[PDB]
């Protein structure tokens, strides 16, 4: 159980935990493109280290690592790497996504010689590869510890190209699913403009929803979120199968994640266009993929002038940041995550515990006006205590930091007795 009443910020006291991990921050170096996944007491982590600019610097090293999350005796979660792999030519590795299964994390990445496929989509030749890493490696064990696989069979249906697109996925039995995106020629995308909700939106036009399904109104492709399915039962050379997301509350394909919470799958999709309110919910079906999106009115994301925070009117825009949240209580539908408390700038990270229509308690992770970008939150039980670990890109240069936050089981003893009685 958790505190279900609105409470002041002091009930949450986050701590930094990345000092035990090789996130070796120094001047003249930037650590970028991060991922975090946490599963069954283990974790996966990745970043790209560049010498110089985060943007234009020479790529030094891409690490893809796994480890364990454990209580060392001081009743907090600590992270230690157990197994790390570095691919050759780190500038070619993009959009990695990690999924845990039994002995391993399986990490699926795109290979690119033309930069980010999203912004170079008509030039990117689809090419994917997978690295499997044991979380508890053992001496002299063949390919148990590290096993590389380049994919060469992908079933994509009507999509021209598909790609992993989000930090982490899920297993169901012995089938793995990675958040993903498909590139569909715009001329083949059909959308009834009557599905575009423009009532009480004086400046919106009915065409805006369909135009904003690609990164610009005349883009060659539209983008559609989904999953890449990897069924270990088939054996041999991997066949990945793309599963498109259903068209309820359809927005441009964007980085997403699927995760298990309290026994059932949950989905988050970043809001990269005009529907700026947070998109998450329980998964109704995995294949075909359909999410029961929350009608959440309190969590949004910073945008730009056309689609700023809390905007709900259709516009042609490609704007926003990935700031996920993790369901921690299904009965009351309470989630935890880090949002950016700012309207048209990526600033002011705030860790919050929230229902659809109310933030229960929240705390700034830094000072007013601190730049921050991607945030990735995963929660779990440590003994009988709920903890969340949040990776936050935060800003002398922006860097991934990992925070740990204990979620309170009650608000205070007197409030607990008042409401419960007995």
């Amino acid at each position: 159980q958790i505190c279900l009443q609105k409470t002041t910020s002091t009930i949450l006291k986050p701590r930094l935990i990345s000092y035990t991990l090789p996130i070796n921050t120094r001047e003249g170096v930037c650590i970028t493109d991060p991922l975090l996944a946490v599963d069954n007491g283990f974790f996966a982590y990745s970043h790209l280290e560049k010498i110089g600019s985060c943007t234009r610097g020479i790529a030094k090293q891409r690490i893809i690592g796994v480890g364990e999350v454990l209580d060392r005796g001081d009743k907090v979660p600590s992270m230690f790497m157990t197994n790390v792999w570095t691919p050759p030519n780190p500038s070619t590795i993009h959009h990695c996504s990690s999924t845990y299964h039994e002995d391993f994390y399986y990490t699926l990445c795109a290979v690119s010689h033309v930069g980010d496929p999203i912004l170079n989509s008509t030039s990117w030749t689809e090419s994917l590869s997978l690295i499997r890493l044991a979380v508890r490696p053992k001496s002299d064990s063949g390919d148990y510890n590290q096993k590389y696989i380049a994919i060469t069979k992908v079933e994509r249906g009507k999509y021209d190209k598909v790609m992993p697109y989000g930090p982490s996925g899920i297993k169901q039995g012995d089938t793995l699913y990675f958040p993903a995106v498909g590139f569909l020629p715009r001329t083949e995308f059909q959308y009834n403009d009557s599905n575009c909700p423009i009532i009480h939106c004086k400046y919106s036009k009915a065409e805006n929803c369909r135009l904003s399904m690609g990164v610009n109104s005349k883009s060659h492709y539209i983008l559609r979120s989904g999953l890449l399915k990897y069924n270990l039962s088939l054996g041999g050379d991997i066949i990945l199968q793309f599963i498109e997301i259903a068209d309820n509350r359809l927005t441009i394909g964007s980085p997403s994640k699927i995760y298990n919470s309290l026994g059932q799958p949950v989905f988050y999709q970043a809001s990269y266009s005009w529907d700026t309110m947070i998109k998450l919910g329980d998964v109704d079906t995995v294949d075909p993929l359909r999410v029961q999106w929350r009608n959440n009115s309190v969590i949004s994301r910073p945008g730009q002038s056309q689609c700023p925070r809390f905007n709900v009117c259709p516009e042609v825009c490609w704007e926003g940041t990935y700031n996920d949240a993790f369901l921690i209580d299904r009965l009351n539908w309470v989630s935890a995550g880090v949002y950016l408390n700012s309207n048209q700038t990526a600033e002011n990270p705030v860790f919050a515990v929230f229902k659809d229509n109310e933030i229960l308690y929240q705390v700034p992770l830094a000072e007013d006006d601190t730049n921050a970008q991607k945030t990735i939150t995963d929660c779990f039980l440590l003994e009988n205590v709920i903890w969340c670990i949040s990776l936050v890109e935060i800003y002398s240069v922006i860097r991934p930091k990992l925070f740990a936050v204990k979620i309170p089981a009650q608000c205070s003893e007197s409030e607990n007795l008042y409401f419960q009685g007995h």
Partner: antibody
Amino acid sequence: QVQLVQSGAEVKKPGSSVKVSCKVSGGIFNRETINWVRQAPGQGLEWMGRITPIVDVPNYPRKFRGRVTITADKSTSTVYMELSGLRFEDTAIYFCARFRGHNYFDPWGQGTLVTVSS
Amino acid sequence: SYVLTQPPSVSVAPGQTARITCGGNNIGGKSVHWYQQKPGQAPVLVVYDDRDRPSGIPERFSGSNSGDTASLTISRVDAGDEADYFCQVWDNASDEAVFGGGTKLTVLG
């Protein structure tokens, strides 16, 4: 059951350097995070830096800049703090201390008195 | 750089209650830990996480934290409780430990 035992007191000329050791016993040396803290006469406690041997990359506050070098030896289960360019104001008791809960220090080494003098 | 502010000295009669304060901007949002140092030896952790006691610490030692002031309260003060008491936080913005200036507890009379 972790125990931290430091090397003995030393005296040094100004401009020279000193290297204090903290011998770690009774835990998993690779995963212990060892911090250094100093205490000058008539002043309080001052954090100087830390290291975790499995990561083996130290961090320091900018007050000390290039003067402090912290290292670790899995050979000996020992962390070392070296302070360069010694000044009269560096006369202090130097403590090592083990990070707990990602926030506090327990236990502490017994302390090493370093005097700088002509 | 976060700054903690302690009184330089506090004095009590034997058996009284001693109150050592530790001030900072919204310190009640940080975790506050307290160390007892005697003139010769190493600091000893007497309170952690605002208000928790480590094994082997007398219950007479208790801490609290709220608003802009955290405090260590020592009940039934003993002459052996004479020491310099340091409050400590971890400043997440600079990622370093911060100590208060210390409060010397004299047991008068």
